[PDB]
Every structure is written in structure tokens, then in C-alpha cells.
Design an enzyme around this catalytic site. Sequence first.
Site, short mmCIF file in Angstrom:
data_model
loop_
_atom_site.label_atom_id
_atom_site.label_comp_id
_atom_site.label_asym_id
_atom_site.label_seq_id
_atom_site.Cartn_x
_atom_site.Cartn_y
_atom_site.Cartn_z
CG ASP A 159 -1.89 1.15 1.24
OD1 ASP A 159 -2.54 1.41 0.21
OD2 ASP A 159 -1.96 1.81 2.30
CG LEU A 160 2.18 5.50 -1.99
CD1 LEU A 160 2.23 5.89 -3.47
CD2 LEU A 160 2.03 6.74 -1.10
CG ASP A 161 -2.26 7.26 -0.15
OD1 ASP A 161 -1.30 7.97 -0.54
OD2 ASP A 161 -3.24 6.99 -0.87
CB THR A 174 -0.23 10.61 1.33
OG1 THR A 174 0.24 9.26 1.20
CG2 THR A 174 0.82 11.60 0.76
CE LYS A 202 -6.21 6.19 8.63
NZ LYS A 202 -5.50 5.81 9.88
CB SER A 250 -1.55 2.59 -4.07
OG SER A 250 -2.21 3.80 -3.74
CB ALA A 251 -7.19 2.34 -3.64
CE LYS A 268 -5.65 -1.33 -1.64
NZ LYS A 268 -4.58 -0.55 -0.93
CD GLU A 325 -3.82 -1.60 2.85
OE1 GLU A 325 -4.14 -0.82 3.79
OE2 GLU A 325 -4.13 -1.40 1.66
CG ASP A 326 -2.79 2.92 6.08
OD1 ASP A 326 -3.00 2.36 4.97
OD2 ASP A 326 -3.18 4.10 6.34
O1 BG6 Z 1 -8.33 9.84 -4.96
P1 BG6 Z 1 -7.16 8.94 -5.20
O2 BG6 Z 1 -5.80 9.63 -5.12
O3 BG6 Z 1 -7.32 8.12 -6.45
O4 BG6 Z 1 -7.06 7.89 -3.98
C1 BG6 Z 1 -7.98 6.86 -3.84
C2 BG6 Z 1 -7.71 6.21 -2.44
O5 BG6 Z 1 -6.35 5.83 -2.35
C3 BG6 Z 1 -6.04 5.09 -1.19
O6 BG6 Z 1 -4.63 4.83 -1.25
C4 BG6 Z 1 -6.33 5.91 0.03
O7 BG6 Z 1 -6.10 5.15 1.19
C5 BG6 Z 1 -7.77 6.45 0.05
O8 BG6 Z 1 -7.94 7.31 1.15
C6 BG6 Z 1 -8.06 7.15 -1.29
O9 BG6 Z 1 -9.45 7.49 -1.37
MG MG Z 2 -3.34 3.14 3.07
#
Ligand code: BG6
Ligand code: MG
Length: 218
Positions: free
Chosen positions: A8-10, A16, A45, A114-115, A145, A169-170
Site C-alpha cells: 500500500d502507499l498512503d 498521505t 482509508k 495502492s487504490a 478494496k 497495509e494501514d
Molecule cells: O483519490 P485517489 O488519489 O485516487 O485515492 C484513492 C484512495 O487511495 C487510497 O490509497 C487511500 O487510502 C484512500 O484514502 C483514497 O481514497
Molecule cells: Mg493506506
Amino acid sequence: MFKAVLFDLDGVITDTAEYHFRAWKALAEEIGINGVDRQFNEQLKGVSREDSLQKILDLADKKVSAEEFKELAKRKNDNYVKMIQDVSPADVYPGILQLLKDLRSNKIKIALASASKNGPFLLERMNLTGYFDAIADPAEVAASKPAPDIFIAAAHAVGVAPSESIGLEDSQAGIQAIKDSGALPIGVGRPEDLGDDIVIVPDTSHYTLEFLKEVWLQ
Ligand SMILES: O=P(O)(O)OC[C@H]1O[C@@H](O)[C@H](O)[C@@H](O)[C@@H]1O
Ligand SMILES: [Mg+2]
Ligand SMILES: [Mg+2]
């Protein structure tokens, strides 16, 4: 031994998740919805942009036109994208850069799961792109997810079975996605938030190759 790590990234690679929260809360309040606090944000999240907005609207109580829905998601993304422009290598979380180096030295594949459609931009800001063997594009999966699709895609993109992989993952949604993929989850956060039924660490300094090995062998 495990053959891939699926990141995962954020909230895992950098802070972030905090910025997504601040941006969603500002948006919700502009439209007169005040339930978006840190406790509620645990349900946001890891969730897609459109699913996040729908969860906020559902909270209280609330429907908008299709045209307004599109405008609101865009407004939040424009704000979030402005917020992240000054992210740099100095913002990489503790342990993460060294982990990436140690994984590559041991010929373990590295994939992004990452999503976020802003994931590639963020890896470039942090000078991390060259550590990744693949990025699973969240716009290519049929289900986001907590569905496992993105973790399965990330593993397959580096030629590894999910059952031969560790996922980092967080989030509640992302932990469920890792479980249902067949990979082994290691969460970062509070068990109060993420559960008492998987391995959880309190911060990313705990993500060492040594510890991933300690867990896999257990
Ligand atoms: O709006 P983005 O940048 O496509 O991100 C989508 C999702 O990305 C995930 O990595 C985050 O945890 C979510 O909070 C976020 O909604
Ligand atoms: Mg995350
Ligand atoms: Mg490259």
C-alpha cells in the site's frame, strides 16, 4: 521464503493518509456534513475516490445529482493534488527506503497495490519509482478494496502467487483485501483500529527484512 512484497502507499510509504483525511473533511463540511472525524475516517482509508464520497454522503443522509457527484470528487482531488506538490524524499516514512533496498538485494519482487490514481506521481516525488518492479493500476481492476483484486493483480504483475507474498497495509479495507487474496498481511497502526487477529506493528520502522522473515517463519 516469500517471493514478493505488495505495498500500500498512503499511510505505509508516507503520511498521505493524513492529507486524504484533511481533504475529505474539508469537502464534507463545504456540503454541510460534519461526521467526518478521525474515527469515521477509519472507514475511508484504502477506499476508492468514488466509494469514499458515497460513504460520506450516506453518513448524513444525503443525495446529490450525478453532475454534482462528479464535481465534488473532482474538487476533493484538485485540493489533494495541490497539497501533495511539496512531498519529497524527506517525507518517506522510517524504515521504508532501507526495506526496499534490502528486498532488491535478496531478489524479492516489489509491487505497488495502492487504490490511489495519484500513486505514480507520489513515488516520483519521493524518488522511489526505481525500487518498484510493478504498479497495479487501480483503474484496471473490476473491484476495489476491500475486494482482493488489486493485491492479486500486483502479485501477478511480478510473476508471483499471492500465497507466496506479504502485503503491507494501514487500513481495515486493505487488510481484508490482503486476507481474501491469499497473501499474508502485516498491518501498521493500532489493533484498536485494525484488529487483534493479524500481525500489527506500531510504526514503519518495524518493517525490516529481518522482521518480515521472523513473521513468515512463525
Ligand atoms: O483519490 P485517489 O488519489 O485516487 O485515492 C484513492 C484512495 O487511495 C487510497 O490509497 C487511500 O487510502 C484512500 O484514502 C483514497 O481514497
Ligand atoms: Mg493506506
Ligand atoms: Mg523503473
